[PDB]
From a paper:
Insulin is a two-chain polypeptide, comprising an A chain of 21 residues that includes two α helices (residues A1 to A8 and A12 to A18, respectively), and a B chain of 30 residues that includes a single α helix (residues B9 to B19). Integral to insulin’s structure are its three disulfide bonds — one intra-chain (CysA6-CysA11) and two inter-chain (CysA7-CysB7 and CysA20-CysB19). Insulin binding to the insulin receptor is currently understood to involve the hormone forming a high-affinity cross-link between two distinct sites (1 and 2) on the receptor surface. Here, we specifically seek to explore the influence of the A6-A11 disulfide bond on insulin structure and function through strategic use of olefin metathesis to replace the A6-A11 disulfide bond of insulin with a C=C double bond.
An unsaturated C=C dicarba bond is considerably more rigid than a disulfide bond and adopts either a cis or trans configuration, with an insurmountable barrier to exchange under physiological conditions. The X-ray crystal structures of the cis- and trans isomers were determined using diffraction data to 2.70 Å and 1.55 Å resolution, respectively, with the crystals being grown under similar conditions. The crystal structure of the trans isomer corresponds to a Class 1 insulin conformation. Residues A1-A9 exhibit a classical α-helical geometry, with the azimuthal positioning of residues A1-A5 being closely similar to that of native insulins within Class 1. However, both molecules within the crystallographic asymmetric unit of the trans isomer show an ordered A chain N-terminal helix. Unlike in the structure of the cis isomer, the respective A-chain N-terminal helices of the two trans isomers are involved in crystal contacts, suggesting their crystallographic order may be brought about by these contacts: in solution, the trans isomer A chain is likely disordered. In receptor phosphorylation assays, the cis isomer was equipotent to insulin in activation of IR-B and IR-A, but slightly poorer than insulin in activation of IGF-1R, whereas the trans isomer was ~1000 fold less potent than insulin in activating IR-B. The crystal structure of the trans isomer indicates that it has a Class 1 conformation, and its inactivity suggests that it is incapable of transitioning to a Class 2 structure.
Numbering used by the authors:
A (entry chain A): 1 to 21
B (entry chain B): 1 to 29
Write the structure that this text describes.
Amino acid sequence: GIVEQACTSIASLYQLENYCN
Amino acid sequence: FVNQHLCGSHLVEALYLVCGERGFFYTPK
């Protein structure tokens, strides 16, 4: 998931927004 | 806080900033 992918790859705004409530 | 590698607590801070009043879910796998 994002926790693993965001450390090894550039995290985007869209990726982050997907985890907002 | 965006368009960079976000390891550990750096991801938590980015979600806090991005999501604002909505809050967020932080879920390691």
